[PDB]
Amino acid sequence: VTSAVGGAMVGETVEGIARYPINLRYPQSWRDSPQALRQLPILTPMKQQI
Amino acid sequence: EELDNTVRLPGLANLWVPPIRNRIDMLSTGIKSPIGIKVSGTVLADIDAM
């Protein structure tokens, strides 16, 4: 929820003097409605589909 | 003069100064030449070629 449906920063790309953020999140199709979040797939460490 | 004429090794350009003046000049991180042109940029290659 902080990254997939979020978009929290994970790092900065450096280009000479400039620094640009790097994002990380799922597509928008999994962000529209609460019903779309109720079905947000998660891969538990047990390698199962929940 | 005798000091300068005695110490001679390849790869050195001798300077004989007072200790206090030498320390002041070492801590003085400014520009010594009469006129100075500062070219600033975002990367090193452009300002060097400029």
Ligand SMILES: [Cu+]
């Ligand atoms: Cu020095």
